[PDB]
Amino acid sequence: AESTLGAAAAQSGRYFGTAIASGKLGDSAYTTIASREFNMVTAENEMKIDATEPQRGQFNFSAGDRVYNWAVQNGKQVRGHTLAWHSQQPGWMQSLSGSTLRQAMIDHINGVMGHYKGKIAQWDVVSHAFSDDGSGGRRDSNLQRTGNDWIEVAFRTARAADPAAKLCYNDYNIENWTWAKTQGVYNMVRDFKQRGVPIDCVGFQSHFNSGSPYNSNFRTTLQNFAALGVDVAITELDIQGASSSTYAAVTNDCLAVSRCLGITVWGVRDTDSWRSGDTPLLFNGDGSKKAAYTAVLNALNGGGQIKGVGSGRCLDVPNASTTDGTQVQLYDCHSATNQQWTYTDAGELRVYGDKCLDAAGTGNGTKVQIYSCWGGDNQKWRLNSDGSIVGVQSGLCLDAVGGGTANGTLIQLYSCSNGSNQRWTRT
């Protein structure tokens, strides 16, 4: 109830989910991670309009049901995505307009929700309905040109089709409270609640990058929407660079809002991401947990010198050398730059400013040394709550050779054993 993301989130009545791609369900490495870590699933594309209604009036749930069945059979709830929006519309719908388009939208909603009636926890009824031009208004689309009330109609339609599902409005770039787009959505939801329009949740995609960075005020945004009487959900979270601090910050924002139902990251491994170039998820392509994974898990579980517990001595660079390939050791702790390590958001343990704790391989006995920082996974580490420090690439623990405790004891990689020569404390 604390070793996996879903289980850790469940401790506070929340979920931690991911986007599942039906085309990857035959990949054992993929499903092993997905079934183990998440208790909520969103079909990445299988429940969209084009996927569910390829031809007007012709519904197809082959792909959607495969994802839905995999989710339920493996113990995960499901978020339906998405009933009505401008993107990925089938060819036939893109050419529709006015009343006929409005009716098509309604028929689609009834068809899809009817198929999954009572089996979906949340439905993204409408998505991407606002512009990014900075006006805070609706974006120009075929759906919007049929009447400004199309969104309201979609929700009223959805409520009737399946009263058991929570109905959400989902969008991106509505995380920062100071943005006009965020205000546009806020005003609409407030209007809906005041007039009784059936809406139960607001989904924040949370696709963060240096173009639209995460800001601490995201929590305020979540709290402001929660105050309107709707639940909130982080629906498609991914962070460019996967900063451990940022991932932990977003996790704590949801935990700080009683109405935040949970968090879904948009994909399992970076190689499965729609934005793989931004290495924005919690697992590497080879399936290894990233530093960000541990940061998130620690947050969900309610969680300078590096001193070894068994030895009482500090991780030290011999004679304050800055030479690449110098194996680190244990040494009496004292004020010195060669014992001052900085844990970065990328998961590095830096010394001297630009040298990185580096594993010279991946197996037991591998030498741990300092080497120029370059971003390799053999230079990334996960700081566990039990005091162990695990190498991302190797999955092995920082280990004081042979359990030595005296000055000069070298540091190596070794299968984690919870031994005192593998436990560290930082001050």
Ligand X SMILES: O=[N+]([O-])c1ccc(O[C@@H]2OC[C@@H](O[C@@H]3OC[C@@H](O)[C@H](O)[C@H]3O)[C@H](O)[C@H]2O)cc1
Q: Is 236 a catalytic residue?
A: yes
Is residue 200 involved in binding ligand X (CB under 6 A)? no
Is residue 127 involved in binding ligand X (CB under 6 A)? yes
CA within 13 Å, CB half, 120: 31
Rounded CA-CA distance 365/51 in Å is 51
- Least Cβ distance, residue 282 to ligand X (angstroms): 16
Is residue 44 involved in binding ligand X (CB under 6 A)? yes
Rounded CA-CA distance 29/418 in Å is 26
Rounded CA-CA distance 363/394 in Å is 7
Catalytic residue, chosen from 44, 53, 236, 348, is 236
Cβ closest to ligand X, residue 280 vs residue 391: 280
Among 70, 123, 172, 214, which residue sits at the site for ligand X (rule: CB under 6 A)?
Answer: 172
Place of tokens 């991407």: 128
Contact 111, 59 (CB under 8 A): yes
Is residue 209 involved in binding ligand X (CB under 6 A)? no
Is residue 205 involved in binding ligand X (CB under 6 A)? yes
Q: Is 359 marked within a binding site?
A: no
Contact 36, 61 (CB under 8 A): no
Among 37, 236, 253, 316, which residue sits at the site for ligand X (rule: CB under 6 A)?
Answer: 236
Contact 400, 311 (CB under 8 A): yes
Cβ closest to ligand X, residue 205 vs residue 279: 205
Please provide the DSSP assignment of 329-381 as one string: EEE---S-GGG--EE-TTS-EEETTTEEEEESSSSTT-BEEEEE----GGG-E
Q: Is 402 marked within a binding site?
A: yes
Place of tokens 């989902």: 170
- Least Cβ distance, residue 92 to ligand X (angstroms): 19
- Least Cβ distance, residue 47 to ligand X (angstroms): 10
Q: Is 403 marked within a binding site?
A: yes
Among 18, 45, 131, 157, which residue sits at the site for ligand X (rule: CB under 6 A)?
Answer: 45
- Least Cβ distance, residue 52 to ligand X (angstroms): 13
Cβ closest to ligand X, residue 67 vs residue 411: 67
Q: Name the pairing type of β-strands 122-127 and 166-171.
A: parallel
Is residue 270 involved in binding ligand X (CB under 6 A)? no
- Least Cβ distance, residue 271 to ligand X (angstroms): 13
Q: Name the pairing type of β-strands 411-414 and 397-400.
A: antiparallel
Comparing CA positions, the residue from 112, 144, 140 lying closest to residue 125 is 112
Annotated binding site: 316, 319, 329, 334, 338, 399-400, 402-403, 421
Active site residues: 236
Annotated binding site for beta-D-galactose: 316, 319, 329, 334, 338, 399-400, 402-403, 421
Query: What is the binding site for ligand X (CB under 6 A)?
Result: 44-45, 127, 172, 205, 207, 236, 274
